[PDB]
Amino acid sequence: TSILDIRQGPKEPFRDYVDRFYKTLRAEQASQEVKNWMTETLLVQNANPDCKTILKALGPGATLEEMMTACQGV
Amino acid sequence: TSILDIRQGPKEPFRDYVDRFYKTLRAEQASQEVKNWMTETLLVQNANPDCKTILKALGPGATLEEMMTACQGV
Amino acid sequence: PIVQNLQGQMVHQAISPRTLNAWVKVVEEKAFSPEVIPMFSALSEGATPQDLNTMLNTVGGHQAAMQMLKETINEEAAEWDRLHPVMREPRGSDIAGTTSTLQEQIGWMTHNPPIPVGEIYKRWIILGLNKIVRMYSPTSILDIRQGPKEPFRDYVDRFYKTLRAEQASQEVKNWMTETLLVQNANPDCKTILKALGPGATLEEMMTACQGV
Amino acid sequence: PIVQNLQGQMVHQAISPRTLNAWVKVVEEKAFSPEVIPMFSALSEGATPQDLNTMLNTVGGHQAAMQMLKETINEEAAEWDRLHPVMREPRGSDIAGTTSTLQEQIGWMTHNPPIPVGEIYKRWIILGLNKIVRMYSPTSILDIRQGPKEPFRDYVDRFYKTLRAEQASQEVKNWMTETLLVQNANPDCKTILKALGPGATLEEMMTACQGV
Amino acid sequence: PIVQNLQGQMVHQAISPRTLNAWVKVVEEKAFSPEVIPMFSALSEGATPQDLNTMLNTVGGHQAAMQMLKETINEEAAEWDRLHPVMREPRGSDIAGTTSTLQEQIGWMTHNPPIPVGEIYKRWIILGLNKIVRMYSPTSILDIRQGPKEPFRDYVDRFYKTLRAEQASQEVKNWMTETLLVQNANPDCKTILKALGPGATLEEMMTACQGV
Amino acid sequence: PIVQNLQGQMVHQAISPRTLNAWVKVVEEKAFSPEVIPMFSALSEGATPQDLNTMLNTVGGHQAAMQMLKETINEEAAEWDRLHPVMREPRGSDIAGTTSTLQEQIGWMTHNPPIPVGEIYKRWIILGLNKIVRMYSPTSILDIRQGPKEPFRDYVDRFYKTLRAEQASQEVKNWMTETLLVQNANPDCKTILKALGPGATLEEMMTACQGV
Amino acid sequence: PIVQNLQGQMVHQAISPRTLNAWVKVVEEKAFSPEVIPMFSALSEGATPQDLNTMLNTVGGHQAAMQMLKETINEEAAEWDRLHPVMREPRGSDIAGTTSTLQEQIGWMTHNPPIPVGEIYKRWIILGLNKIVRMYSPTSILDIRQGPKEPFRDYVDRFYKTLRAEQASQEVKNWMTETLLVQNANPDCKTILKALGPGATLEEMMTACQGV
Amino acid sequence: TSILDIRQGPKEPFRDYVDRFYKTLRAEQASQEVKNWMTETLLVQNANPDCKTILKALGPGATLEEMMTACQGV
Amino acid sequence: TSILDIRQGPKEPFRDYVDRFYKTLRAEQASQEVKNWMTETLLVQNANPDCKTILKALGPGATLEEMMTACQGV
Amino acid sequence: TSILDIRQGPKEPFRDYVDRFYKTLRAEQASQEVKNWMTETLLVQNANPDCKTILKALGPGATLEEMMTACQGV
Amino acid sequence: TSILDIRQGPKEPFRDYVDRFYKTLRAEQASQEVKNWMTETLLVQNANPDCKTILKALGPGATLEEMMTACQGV
Amino acid sequence: TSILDIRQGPKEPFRDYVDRFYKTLRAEQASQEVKNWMTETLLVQNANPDCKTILKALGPGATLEEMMTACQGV
Amino acid sequence: TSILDIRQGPKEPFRDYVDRFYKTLRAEQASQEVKNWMTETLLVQNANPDCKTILKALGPGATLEEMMTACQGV
Amino acid sequence: TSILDIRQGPKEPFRDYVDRFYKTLRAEQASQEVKNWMTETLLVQNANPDCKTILKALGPGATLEEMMTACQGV
Amino acid sequence: TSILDIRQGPKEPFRDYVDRFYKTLRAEQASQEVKNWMTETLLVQNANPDCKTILKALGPGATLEEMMTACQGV
Structure with missing residues (x-):
């Protein structure tokens, strides 16, 4: 699995998806600005729709803390 | 249509509603203090229930760029 | 407020206990509906900054409202010092009545022409009460x-x-x-x-x- | 109002903070039902034009009511100057208390015979309050x-x-x-x-x- | 009411603006239920006939009630002149305070023994208020x-x-x-x-x- | 109540018209619920027997309540004479203020030590008001x-x-x-x-x- | 409260009958909702311990509330004596105003610097009223x-x-x-x-x- | 019957009711101030709805002669 | 028709009956006291019942003005 | 009919109602201050729901010429 | 049973209820001021609707002899 | 009939029974203390139950006036 | 089409009728007072009934601005 | 789960609820004044209806040892 | 029966069980600390469930007075 094809399932809790995403990101180990892009754009774009709407409600530039505490009810 | 009648439909994209709103706001050509008030309060109040909560979460300081960026995912 | 003594000197009369209780009834029972600004402006009418602080101590029970007053008073005291760079000089915290003596407040209010530090501080308070009244609006x-x-x-x-x-x-x-x-x-x-x-x-x- | 000083001179006493708060409660809570005219006439009772202006500053929150008062006061001041063409002379805006000093108002109210500029201006105000009370009638x-x-x-x-x-x-x-x-x-x-x-x-x- | 001056002479003090507003609240808000008689009798307590007329000017808004007061006052003034045929003499319209000067009223109230023209006129008013309270009864x-x-x-x-x-x-x-x-x-x-x-x-x- | 004159002599000040109207509002509007005793005790606070009689004249409209007060006052005046057999002597009807002059009441209240005929009569009245409050209880x-x-x-x-x-x-x-x-x-x-x-x-x- | 006499000496003025009736209305009608603390603090504002005791005599009708006040006042008087071991010395029961004379209370309140025995005792009372307000809370x-x-x-x-x-x-x-x-x-x-x-x-x- | 129970029947002539009223009023033999009050107010209040309006239209000053003269036509 | 046999019909308005009555009275032209008796007694006695009750509610001695304004609703 | 009973029917022309109103107003012959009040307020209040809104839109200053001119099209 | 639970049955003789009441009052052995209050008020309030009216008609001053004498006929 | 066997019927008004009782008592003309006993005890004991309860509600020693005014509603 | 026969249809918005009217008026180019008459009288008389009533509610002499803003809801 | 969501089930032993409560209280790691408040009030308010009355009967001074000792029998 | 096998029945009032318990305890006459243990632990443990819960609601160390007055409603 590339980081590009890690995706959140319908039932999958956001914290499980985030852990899969960042483990894949850590292994795939692209350069820092590619990691910035992936953690800002792919992390949201590959979230499931119910998380993706809650994430975009935060506006870009939020921390991972704020993203996880936001999605924790989904 | 008066600007007070420009209301976002339940499935209408926020960008299409903003386009209608600011077109009507330009046609009505109320003075700038009134336009400022309308862009700050009325644009939010007339958004549909999906977008309206996103816009409130940005706070009154939101800029039209931020408002559209956030609502683009609805 | 300020009164004339029998010796002719201007002197402090403390804001009366039932004027304070009238202000307490305004703060407590009206829930910062807009009436609370005219009623403040009325009950305050003769007030020195010491008296105005005695009135604000009533809002001190509404800690959310009280901090908006503290903020707006500190803000206006700073802006006062900013517009008015330095019978002592009336500085912002002196107009607030934290820094100044009572005799200094009455002196300022009774020089010729006077510096109306009471009406000034009362105006900063009314600007804070406007913020609070706005927050407590039930509807837009x-x-x-x-x-x-x-x-x-x-x-x-x-x-x-x-x-x-x-x-x-x-x-x-x-x-x-x-x-x-x-x-x-x-x-x-x-x-x-x-x-x-x-x-x-x-x-x-x-x-x-x-x-x- | 006017009081006698211990030196025997007539002198201003400011309209009391709770008399102003009583008038605020009348303006705010009664929504210009007809009671607002007797209550004005009562609370005003001793008032100089300076005091009457201090009372009207309460109506200044009801900008629609306040402009009807401004109108009727300007109208009656003009008509006063029209009936009374020109110890200074009491002109219309002097009776309104925009033009006149406090000492001029008390002087007029204490010459022999007096010119009752308080009761005059109070009558123009009551004519304006009658217009406002009429507008706020719920029914014909x-x-x-x-x-x-x-x-x-x-x-x-x-x-x-x-x-x-x-x-x-x-x-x-x-x-x-x-x-x-x-x-x-x-x-x-x-x-x-x-x-x-x-x-x-x-x-x-x-x-x-x-x-x- | 009557007060002692610092020179020792008895002198008029005008009925206070909030005592008048208390009487206005009685006349306006209680619709001549029987409470209006004790409250009149209380708020009137020190009143000269000039002060009592200042109170009746409040009832002047209720033109039906006011004419019953005018009637009963004229009736009792006539009957007073009838029982008391003629430091001037206190005649009926002098007790009503239409005819008499303020100094005459206070003089009568402060001779030894006094003629209590205040309490007399106040009693004629209370007899008129009794008629009005009776008329406004909701039920027999x-x-x-x-x-x-x-x-x-x-x-x-x-x-x-x-x-x-x-x-x-x-x-x-x-x-x-x-x-x-x-x-x-x-x-x-x-x-x-x-x-x-x-x-x-x-x-x-x-x-x-x-x-x- | 009693006040010091500018000549230093103790002298009567009449119970104020709005203190009487406050007591009228207590008697009229509260229907002898138990609040009527603390409110009596408060509004009475400085009262001479002349002032206390001026307050009881308000209860005189409730003829059933008033006769219980008359009874309890006569009862306690008799028992006072019974415990205290005979700068005149304060007899029971003198404490009630039917027999005594105003100067006698103030004298008693200002001898050293004083005889507190006000607070005594006020206590007999409060014992009568307790009977009335008990009668008007809605429930046991x-x-x-x-x-x-x-x-x-x-x-x-x-x-x-x-x-x-x-x-x-x-x-x-x-x-x-x-x-x-x-x-x-x-x-x-x-x-x-x-x-x-x-x-x-x-x-x-x-x-x-x-x-x- | 304390006032200046015409001879320049500080002297007691008794807490006014309508200020006491305002406090009675607070104790009686508000059922110890939290408003009762600002209203106490306001109506008390100038009070000596004699005046504060005159106010607490109103709470004496609520025997459950009154014993919590007695407790908290005795507790704080003891703790005062504990922190302050011994123009006489202000002891705890002297600040409560059971032990001290009125002249002692005013003396303490008017030495330079003063001992504010009024504001101290008023603070112990407010701590007791806080306990009572807490007990009467309808909900957690x-x-x-x-x-x-x-x-x-x-x-x-x-x-x-x-x-x-x-x-x-x-x-x-x-x-x-x-x-x-x-x-x-x-x-x-x-x-x-x-x-x-x-x-x-x-x-x-x-x-x-x-x-x- | 107390005088307060003496009430005119819907078809009862006013003269027969007055006869019952003043007979009962004489039997009860209340003092003259009370009798005066009863003859003035209670005699009217206890009349039947037909006569009661006639009696009110005469005003409180009506005399028993006038009251009976007026109600004779009911 | 004698004045004695002029009578108000069931549907006849009072003013029409009064005009018939006073025209007959004017023609029959009895002496003044007989006219007084007729205008006070026959005028009421020959009114229809709905007018007759309203007239007797006025009490005797009323003017013709007051009698007509009273019956005008019948 | 009193002037207070003169009310415009739902299909009645405003000119026919004004004719009835001012005929009754002339018959009642109330004093001129009362007539002025009736012509200003009561003529409007008694108009039918179609005309009444037209008359209110002219404001209290309307003259009978203007009132009739406006309502002629109803 | 507390004394507050001692209540007279609808057909229970007043003497049998008094026997139960004063037996329970002796067992509870409250101080004499409280007993006095209970014998004066509570004994009346707990009587059944037949006896309770008899006891009230004697007034608060009734003595147990008088209370029993009166209720013996129920 | 002896005074001992005079008794109130079910429908008999108390005043009729009292009149029969006291007429029999007057004729039988026992000594004064026997009359006292009869007028206090037999008069109540031979009343009908609805009167007897109302009488005992008065307590012994009442006058005949008070007994009659009490029973007058039965 | 003469200006005399330009007329508003049932569904036709007032602004479309006004534009047809004034284009025809501009072409037909009668003298100024005839144009005044046509723009005041024919413009209203040839409006459809729902506009014609709203126009006459304005009273004669209104501007074309006020006429158009008035009819804009029809 | 927030500590405010930790509520005792109707059949859940008080010791198992306390274990959940103090585990969540340790995880949330609010400052000690807030923990003190939660252990004193919220632990009681969130108990089930059986245990809650037992805990209230111990008064606010109860110690967790005493609270558990008392509720062990539920 | 040993004190160990004295037990409260389902219908048995607590005072009857306590009397059986303490009579058995008095006869079996174990040493004082064994009696302390039995009167604190067995007395509660052998109570019926409805009493046992009410007893444990008191917390250990209560007097026998308080235990009996507590269970008296069961």
Whole structure:
């Protein structure tokens, strides 16, 4: 699995998806600005729709803390 | 249509509603203090229930760029 | 307040216990509806900054309201020092009455011409109370709509009450009373309010809508 | 108001903070029902034009009411100058207390005979408050009808309250109390009110309709 | 009212603005229920005829009530001149305070022994207010009946309130409280009120009917 | 009340018109609920017997209440003469202020040590008002039961209000608050009030029953 | 309170009869809701311990409340003697005003610098009133939940009112307003209050929830 | 019957009711101030709905002669 | 028709009956006291019952003005 | 009919109602201050719902010429 | 049974109820001021509806001899 | 009939029974203390039950006036 | 089409009728007072009934601005 | 779960609820004044209806040892 | 029966069980600390469940008075 094809399932809790995403990101180990892009754009774009709407409600530039505490009810 | 009648439909994209709103706001050509008030309060109040909560979460300081960026995912 | 002594000197008279209890009834029972600003302005009327602090100690029970007052008073004291760079000089915290003595406050209020540090601080307080009154508004003006069988007098009262709570400058208020007040009327009144045309004063609107 | 100093000179005493708060409660809580005119006339009782302006600053929150007062005061000041063409002379804006000093107002109020610039300006204000009370009337007198099970005392109270808000001269009021009050009664009372004949006083009407 | 000056002379102090506003609240808000007589008698307490006229100017808004006062005052002034045929003499219209100067009123009130023209005129006014309170009664005493589940305390309150509005002399009042109060009770209370027998005081009636 | 004159002599100041109107509002509007005793005791606070008679003249409209006051005052004046057999001597009817001059009352109140004829007569009046408050109680304490969904704070308020109207000595009151207050609670509260055991203070009872 | 005599000496003026009646209305009619502390603090404002005892004699009708005051006053008087071991010395029961003369109280309040035995005893009383206000709370803060159609302004008012009755220190209050106020909101408001994030001030919470 | 129980029947002539009223009033023999009050107010209040309006139209000053003269036509 | 046999019909308005009555009275032209008796007694006695009750509610001695304004609703 | 009973029918022309109103106003012959009040307020209040709104839109200053001119089209 | 639970049955003789009441009052052995209050008020309030009215008619001053003498006929 | 066997019927008004009782007592003309006993005890004991309860509600020693006014509703 | 026969249809918005009217008036180019008459009288008389009533509610002499803003809801 | 969501089930042992409560209280790691408040008030308020009454009967001073000792029998 | 096998029945009132318990304890006459243990532990443990819960609601160390007054409603 590339980081590009890690995706959140319908039932999958956001914290499980985030852990899969960042483990894949850590292994795939692209350069820092590619990691910035992936953690800002792919992390949201590959979230499931119910998380993706809650994430975009935060506006870009939020921390991972704020993203996880936001999605924790989904 | 008066600007007070420009209301976002339940499935209408926020960008299409903003386009209608600011077109009507330009046609009505109320003075700038009134336009400022309308862009700050009325644009939010007339958004549909999906977008309206996103816009409130940005706070009154939101800029039209931020408002559209956030609502683009609805 | 300030009174003349029998020796002719200006001297402090403490704000009376029932004037303070009247202000307590205003702060407690009115929940910062807009009446709380005229009633403050009235009960404060002669007040020195020491007396005004004695009044604000009542708002100190509403810790959320009290910090907005503290903020706006600190803000205006700083801006005062900013516009007025340095019989001592009336500095911002001296006008607030934290720094100044009572004799300094009365002195400022009784030089010729006086420096009205009471009325100044009272104006900073009223600007803070305006923020609090705005926060405690139950509705925005866009939520105020006339009922299907509600008198136009009641709807006008609700409208102007809400309009008076809100931040709107006079130009925005004028636009609201000209256009929201018509738009948000019930259809029976809205017909007449349109038929008068846009140049109608509130008197003409009300006397036309009377009993509808 | 005016008081005697210990030196025997007439001098200003400021209108008390709780008298102002009483007037604020009148302006705010009564929504310009006709009670607001007797209560103004009472709380104003000793007032100089400076004090009357301090009271009108309370109405300044009701910008629609306040401009009717400004209008009627400017109108009466102009008409005063028109009837009274020119120890200085009391001009219209001097009676309003925009132009005059406090010492000028008290002087006029304490010459022999005095010029009662307080009671004059107070009368122009009461004429403006009459306009405002009329605008805020919930109903016209023709809308006041008795309920099918409403006491005639309640209906008389509603009627005379509305009659007291309206512009009617005393001749028109007399016709209304003689004929509308009968016409708009419920049929049970209307029978008795007719059977008394047209020359019945309100006392005779009420004591006949008592408990119906 | 009358006060002692620092020079020792008796002198007029004008009836205070909030005492007048208290009287306005009595006249306006209580609709001439019987409370309006004790409250008049209280707020009037020190009043000269000039002050009493300043109070009656409040009733002048209720033109039907005001003419009953004018009538009863003219009637009693005439009867005063009739019983008292002629440091000037206190004539009826002088006691009314239309004819007399303020200094004449205070003089009469401060001769030794005084002529209490204030308390006299105040008594004629209270006799007029009694007529008005009677006219505004919502019910006659014969209409006052206890509800099927109404406390005897509430019914006694309603009864004595109505009894206090009515024209009944004390002998007629005594008969009413002895017999109507029993007759018009609900059957549960009426049983006990009969079982006490006719010589029962109101205390004995109430404590027996308590909680029924 | 009594005040110091500028000449240093103690002198009468008449009980103020709005203090009398405050007492009228207490007598009229509260229907002798137990609040009427603290409010009497407060408004009376400085009163001479002349002033206390001026207050009782307000109760004179409630002829049933007024005769209980007359009775209790005559009773206590007689018992005063009985305990105190005979700068004149303060006799019972002199303390009542029917017999004594105003100067005699103030003299007694300002000898060294004083005879507090005001506070004495005020205590006889309060004993009469206690009888009247007891008569006007809507319920006996045995009738006070908690509703099935009534807060224990409301029930405690109703209970202690009724307990405060009744004749119970402090020992009987203590037994009532210990046992009736539990017995008459609803079953939800009654369970907890029993589980605390009999030695529970009202604070412990209320904080346990809070929100039940 | 304390006033300056015409001879320049500080002297007692008794707490006015209508200030006492205002305090009676606070104790009687408000049932120890938290307003009773600001209103005490206001009406007390100039009070000597003799005056404060005259105010507490009003609470003496609420024997359960009065013993909590007695307790807290005795407790603080003992702790005062404990921190302050022994122009006489102000001992605890002297500050309570059981032991001290009136002249001793005014002396302490007018030495240079003064010992503010009035404001001290007033602070012990306010600590007792806080205990009583807490006992009479109708609900704990955990019981305060928003209704399904209740304005967030009303719910905030209920919440902060209850929060103000409770014993919570400011750190616990801060946690409550940050987290209970969100948790106990209805789901419509709770969504927005969560979407603002945890760092939201009450102003930001209210203006976002306005009209929901 | 007390005087308060003496009430005019719906078809009873006013003269027969007055005869019952003043007979009962003589039997009860209340003092003259109370009798005056009863003859003035209670005699009117206890009349039937037909006569009661006639009596009110005469005003409180009506004399028993005038009251009976007026009600004779009912 | 004698004045004695002029009578108001069931549907006849009072003013029409009064005009018939006074025209007959004017023609029959009895002496003044007989006219007084007829205008006070026959005028009421020959009114229809609904007018006759309203007339007797006025009490004798009323003017013809007051009699007509009273009956005008019948 | 009193002037207070003169009310415009739902299909009645405003000119026919004005003719009835001013005929009744002339018959009642109330004093001129009362007539002025009736012509200003009561003529408007008694108009039918179609005309009444037209008359209110002219304001209280309307003259009978203007009132009739405006209502001629109903 | 507490004394507050001792209540007279609808057909129970007043003497049998008094026997139960004063037996329970002796067992509870509350202090004499409380006993006095209970004998004066509670004994009356707990009587059945037939006897309770008899006891109230004697007034608060009734003595147990008088109370029993009166209720013996129920 | 002896005074001992004079008794009130079920429908008999108390005043009729009292008149029969005291006429029999007057004729039978026992000594004064026997009359006292009969007028206090037999008069109540031979009343019908509805009167007898109302009489005992008065307590012994009442006058005949009070006994008759009490029973007058039965 | 003469200006005399330009007429508003049932569904036709007032602004479309006004534009047809004034284009025809501009082409037909009668003298100024005839144009005044046509723009005041024919413009209203040839409006459809729902507009014609709203126009006459304005009273004669209104501007074309006020006429168009008035009819814009029809 | 927040500590405010930790509520005792109707059949859940008080020791198992306390274990959940103090585990969540340790995880949330609010400052000690807030923990003190939660252990004193919230632990009681969130108990089930059986245990809650037991805990209230111990008073606010109860210690967790005493609270558990008492509720062990539920 | 040993004190160990004295037990409260389902219907048995607590005072009857306590009397059986303490009579058995008095006869079996174990040493004082064994009696302390039995009166604290066995007395509660052998109570019926409805009493046992009410007893444990008191917390250990209560007097026998408080235990009996507590269970008296069961």
